[PDB]
Design a binder for this molecule. Sequence first.
Ligand SMILES: [Mg+2]
Ligand SMILES: [Mg+2]
Ligand SMILES: [Mg+2]
Ligand SMILES: [Mg+2]
Ligand SMILES: [Mg+2]
Ligand SMILES: [Mg+2]
Ligand SMILES: [Mg+2]
Ligand SMILES: [Mg+2]
Ligand SMILES: [Mg+2]
Ligand SMILES: [Mg+2]
Ligand SMILES: [Mg+2]
Ligand SMILES: [Mg+2]
Ligand SMILES: [Mg+2]
Ligand SMILES: [Mg+2]
Ligand SMILES: [Mg+2]
Ligand SMILES: [Mg+2]
Ligand SMILES: [Mg+2]
Ligand SMILES: [Mg+2]
Ligand SMILES: [Mg+2]
Ligand SMILES: [Mg+2]
Ligand SMILES: [Mg+2]
Ligand SMILES: [Mg+2]
Ligand SMILES: [Mg+2]
Ligand SMILES: [Mg+2]
Ligand SMILES: [Mg+2]
Ligand SMILES: [Mg+2]
Ligand SMILES: [Mg+2]
Ligand SMILES: [Mg+2]
Ligand SMILES: [Mg+2]
Ligand SMILES: [Mg+2]
Ligand SMILES: [Mg+2]
Ligand SMILES: [Mg+2]
Ligand SMILES: [Mg+2]
Ligand SMILES: [Mg+2]
Ligand SMILES: [Mg+2]
Ligand SMILES: [Mg+2]
Ligand SMILES: [Mg+2]
Ligand SMILES: [Mg+2]
Ligand SMILES: [Mg+2]
Ligand SMILES: [Mg+2]
Ligand SMILES: [Mg+2]
Ligand SMILES: [Mg+2]
Ligand SMILES: [Mg+2]
Ligand SMILES: [Mg+2]
Ligand SMILES: [Mg+2]
Ligand SMILES: [Mg+2]
Ligand SMILES: [Mg+2]
Ligand SMILES: [Mg+2]
Ligand SMILES: [Mg+2]
Ligand SMILES: [Mg+2]
Ligand SMILES: [Mg+2]
Ligand SMILES: [Mg+2]
Ligand SMILES: [Mg+2]
Ligand SMILES: [Mg+2]
Ligand SMILES: [Mg+2]
Ligand SMILES: [Mg+2]
Ligand SMILES: [Mg+2]
Ligand SMILES: [Mg+2]
Ligand SMILES: [Mg+2]
Ligand SMILES: [Mg+2]
Ligand SMILES: [Mg+2]
Ligand SMILES: [Mg+2]
Ligand SMILES: [Mg+2]
Ligand SMILES: [Mg+2]
Ligand SMILES: [Mg+2]
Ligand SMILES: [Mg+2]
Ligand SMILES: [Mg+2]
Ligand SMILES: [Mg+2]
Ligand SMILES: [Mg+2]
Ligand SMILES: [Mg+2]
Ligand SMILES: [Mg+2]
Ligand SMILES: [Mg+2]
Lengths: 112, 100, 202, 115, 50
Amino acid sequence: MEAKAIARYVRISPRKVRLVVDLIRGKSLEEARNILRYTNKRGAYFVAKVLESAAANAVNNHDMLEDRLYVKAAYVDEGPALKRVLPRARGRADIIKKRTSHITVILGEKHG
Amino acid sequence: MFAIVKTGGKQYRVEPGLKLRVEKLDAEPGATVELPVLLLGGEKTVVGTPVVEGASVVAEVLGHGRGKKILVSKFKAKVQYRRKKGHRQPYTELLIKEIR
Amino acid sequence: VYQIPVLSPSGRRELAADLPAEINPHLLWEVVRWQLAKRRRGTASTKTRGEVAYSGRKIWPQKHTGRARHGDIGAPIFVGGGVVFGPKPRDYSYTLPKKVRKKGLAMAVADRAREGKLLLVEAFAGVNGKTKEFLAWAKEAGLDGSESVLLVTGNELVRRAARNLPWVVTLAPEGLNVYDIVRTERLVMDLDAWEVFQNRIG
Amino acid sequence: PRAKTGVVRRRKHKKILKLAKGYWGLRSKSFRKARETLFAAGNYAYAHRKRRKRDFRRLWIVRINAACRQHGLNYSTFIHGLKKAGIEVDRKNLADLAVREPQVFAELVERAKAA
Amino acid sequence: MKLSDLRPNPGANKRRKRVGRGPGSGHGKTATRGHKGQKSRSGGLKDPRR
RNA sequence: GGGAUGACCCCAGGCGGUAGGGGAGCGUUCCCGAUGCCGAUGAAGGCCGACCCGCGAGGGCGGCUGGAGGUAAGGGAAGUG
RNA sequence: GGUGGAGCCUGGGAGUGAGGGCGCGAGCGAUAACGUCCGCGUCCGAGCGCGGGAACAACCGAGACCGCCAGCUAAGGCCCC
RNA sequence: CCGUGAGGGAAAGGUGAAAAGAACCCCGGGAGGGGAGUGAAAUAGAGCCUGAAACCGUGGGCUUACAAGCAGUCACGGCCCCGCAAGGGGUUGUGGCGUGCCUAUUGAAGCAUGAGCCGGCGACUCACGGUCGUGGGCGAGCUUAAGCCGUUGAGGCGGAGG
Ligand SMILES: [Mg+2]
Ligand SMILES: [Mg+2]
Ligand SMILES: [Mg+2]
Ligand SMILES: [Mg+2]
Ligand SMILES: [Mg+2]
Ligand SMILES: [Mg+2]
Ligand SMILES: [Mg+2]
Ligand SMILES: [Mg+2]
Ligand SMILES: [Mg+2]
Ligand SMILES: [Mg+2]
Ligand SMILES: [Mg+2]
Ligand SMILES: [Mg+2]
Ligand SMILES: [Mg+2]
Ligand SMILES: [Mg+2]
Ligand SMILES: [Mg+2]
Ligand SMILES: [Mg+2]
Ligand SMILES: [Mg+2]
Ligand SMILES: [Mg+2]
Ligand SMILES: [Mg+2]
Ligand SMILES: [Mg+2]
Ligand SMILES: [Mg+2]
Ligand SMILES: [Mg+2]
Ligand SMILES: [Mg+2]
Ligand SMILES: [Mg+2]
Ligand SMILES: [Mg+2]
Ligand SMILES: [Mg+2]
Ligand SMILES: [Mg+2]
Ligand SMILES: [Mg+2]
Ligand SMILES: [Mg+2]
Ligand SMILES: [Mg+2]
Ligand SMILES: [Mg+2]
Ligand SMILES: [Mg+2]
Ligand SMILES: [Mg+2]
Ligand SMILES: [Mg+2]
Ligand SMILES: [Mg+2]
Ligand SMILES: [Mg+2]
Ligand SMILES: [Mg+2]
Ligand SMILES: [Mg+2]
Ligand SMILES: [Mg+2]
Ligand SMILES: [Mg+2]
Ligand SMILES: [Mg+2]
Ligand SMILES: [Mg+2]
Ligand SMILES: [Mg+2]
Ligand SMILES: [Mg+2]
Ligand SMILES: [Mg+2]
Ligand SMILES: [Mg+2]
Ligand SMILES: [Mg+2]
Ligand SMILES: [Mg+2]
Ligand SMILES: [Mg+2]
Ligand SMILES: [Mg+2]
Ligand SMILES: [Mg+2]
Ligand SMILES: [Mg+2]
Ligand SMILES: [Mg+2]
Ligand SMILES: [Mg+2]
Ligand SMILES: [Mg+2]
Ligand SMILES: [Mg+2]
Ligand SMILES: [Mg+2]
Ligand SMILES: [Mg+2]
Ligand SMILES: [Mg+2]
Ligand SMILES: [Mg+2]
Ligand SMILES: [Mg+2]
Ligand SMILES: [Mg+2]
Ligand SMILES: [Mg+2]
Ligand SMILES: [Mg+2]
Ligand SMILES: [Mg+2]
Ligand SMILES: [Mg+2]
Ligand SMILES: [Mg+2]
Ligand SMILES: [Mg+2]
Ligand SMILES: [Mg+2]
Ligand SMILES: [Mg+2]
Ligand SMILES: [Mg+2]
Ligand SMILES: [Mg+2]
């Protein structure tokens, strides 16, 4: 049995948040818990939330027995990007895109 | 024992009991074929001449195939010239039964 | 073709007629082509760069912007611009030699008649139009609705009687047209009609 | 009536991109690079089917010309002693002779040395 | 004789008009028009009969 | 030549190709065919295929998806690649 | 003599009307130019398809309908690459 | 929305038969999600029919750190996969060979033009005349126009004229 959480439309760049997600993959839930707290990235917050909801969802829904949880697989896909206008020199105006991440943590049970 | 036989303008090394694919020849299926006249024995010294006569190989005509399609293509740059032609090549199959 | 089975309530008798012996499938086809052309609505239209609702103004300057070069946005090269050689209203009708029309009529009958499929009748009595009534007289005349019928009579009452049948198509005699003959499996007339059909061809 | 592109152009492009599966970069994923790549895979294949024949004959020969020098003569003469003895059986494809059946080779070198 | 059989003789179909569509058919690119200049231009040459 | 007045066997030849000329086909939208036929025991569209037919454009078939349409043979007309 | 993708007549559709290299014959140039202008041929143009020339449109070989893990040759080659 | 003004002038349609539009519970500040429930279908959940391509991502198979290249093609071999095997699919180590597409030019891989990639829009037409060809009707003739009558998308009449 396995359990997930998906945070959707998180306003943060997929490239940026993917990096911390890589930090905790295949980690026991307890090392994953410690790694994000002491990681310094705006995306350690957002992942830790998804981590938990999946940990919650695991025990609390699918009857998964917390102590053996690890992170089976996990990843952030790229949501729809909001575009804004950035006025520039000589009348010019580019557009910058504030992006979006769909964070997914998927939990499964250790075999010990 | 083996022969070295000649069919469709090519020359193959045959054992008796061997299924081997050969240029398409005119015959019904299941019929027998006497394969002219070959070129060598596998007990040696007979080689000789163009073709050692009185020996022959008898293979039975198994069936008439068409090989996997080759797509033959021709392109010529800057002249706006392309050609596509599919070609799959008729052939027959036979089983080598005994050697004369 | 020649020997044609009339129905008068007394006799089963046959009639000999006219009716060219050989037929010309092209000639037939050519009249059908005509008939379905001249009835074309001719109705499709579209807007040229000229008729489109935008302005005459030149989009950019044409040198030194480094975009490509342009006229008005109504130009067909633009999305939502004019159409190029698309449809305007036109009239698809043209005039067949009268003599071809006439031949093709006489022929289309004959083709039916040498199939035997043509039947002449008198008076019905599946008159007084009620499809239920007609449906009787028909089953008597051997029409079971096992093949399409083109009914030609000047009788208004026998017409409306037949009309709603899926397998029956109805016509006055001056309505005789080779299209409607060819789409119908067999042909049926009365001895008015058939007389005006004569007095028509030749 | 109006007939717009609809389903046609997608099927044409799709036909190509299957042909290119396995190529590098856009040449597998882009209709255009895929086409361009293919054109050349076309003529290359053709060319090399012509020269697949050339390629093999040389390998046949080198193996032949190899085994003779073992028995003390060269290729160029070996063919003559064989074109003479009438033995045009060798059909250099059977230098599969020379490897698998050595004593059948030796006896052929003999009718070859007697020219 | 039914509608399904009607159809014309071998000519007078004739249809199969001409083209500026693909390579292969000729009729392609420059489209019968031949490269060039004033004839290839849209409103064409000046009226040959004079 | 084979006399089958032919759609077909045999034999002999020709078949690099730009501007161009010629010829045969494939496919797309629409009409007659149609008050019909296919369809929820699954339409059009999509995703796969190492399978079958075609020289090729293409057509089949099969599986998955999809969920309400599609439209043979023969012919007609174009906002047809 | 010569049956040839030979010829001539009538008629429908053309494209071309910037050529280029090389051999040979001249003129211009300086018995210069990958120069220039003519003539006869050729080849590239359109054969940047194939083999040779180390590589290289036009020099030597040779006119590619398709397929083969069959053979003989051309120019050019046979010490090793 | 742009423009002082005349004036310019867009984008943007679709849950399901039915809102039955997901009470309640769990993580959460929320957003979002996980169970529950509805539903024939919920990767039909409202950023809602189908859901292509470019593009980004996770998992797997084969592979790569003494080679050098228009990226392919021919061959053999190693590994993985489908199987009845002589079989086929994937991948690619080594060896042969190999100067992108279009355009324009006597000549382009060309260090000459155009193109970041994908999807969709995108250019030889119609009318009337003319001229050849072709499929048919009638032939010393052929043929009607405007109009009149009639018509389930029924045709016929009309001979001025050409
Ligand atoms: Mg600034
Ligand atoms: Mg400013
Ligand atoms: Mg950008
Ligand atoms: Mg090239
Ligand atoms: Mg060129
Ligand atoms: Mg305007
Ligand atoms: Mg103006
Ligand atoms: Mg620019
Ligand atoms: Mg428009
Ligand atoms: Mg617009
Ligand atoms: Mg619009
Ligand atoms: Mg289009
Ligand atoms: Mg060779
Ligand atoms: Mg066209
Ligand atoms: Mg052409
Ligand atoms: Mg042509
Ligand atoms: Mg032309
Ligand atoms: Mg041009
Ligand atoms: Mg020019
Ligand atoms: Mg002009
Ligand atoms: Mg031939
Ligand atoms: Mg040709
Ligand atoms: Mg030629
Ligand atoms: Mg159902
Ligand atoms: Mg459709
Ligand atoms: Mg389907
Ligand atoms: Mg249809
Ligand atoms: Mg059709
Ligand atoms: Mg178009
Ligand atoms: Mg000629
Ligand atoms: Mg001429
Ligand atoms: Mg000039
Ligand atoms: Mg000149
Ligand atoms: Mg000159
Ligand atoms: Mg010249
Ligand atoms: Mg000089
Ligand atoms: Mg010069
Ligand atoms: Mg000059
Ligand atoms: Mg000059
Ligand atoms: Mg010259
Ligand atoms: Mg040129
Ligand atoms: Mg030439
Ligand atoms: Mg070159
Ligand atoms: Mg060379
Ligand atoms: Mg050359
Ligand atoms: Mg040739
Ligand atoms: Mg020599
Ligand atoms: Mg050398
Ligand atoms: Mg304002
Ligand atoms: Mg609805
Ligand atoms: Mg759900
Ligand atoms: Mg779905
Ligand atoms: Mg759905
Ligand atoms: Mg969306
Ligand atoms: Mg629906
Ligand atoms: Mg959807
Ligand atoms: Mg991966
Ligand atoms: Mg070293
Ligand atoms: Mg290494
Ligand atoms: Mg290689
Ligand atoms: Mg260009
Ligand atoms: Mg230019
Ligand atoms: Mg130039
Ligand atoms: Mg120049
Ligand atoms: Mg470059
Ligand atoms: Mg420049
Ligand atoms: Mg360039
Ligand atoms: Mg496109
Ligand atoms: Mg005209
Ligand atoms: Mg005309
Ligand atoms: Mg005539
Ligand atoms: Mg009226």
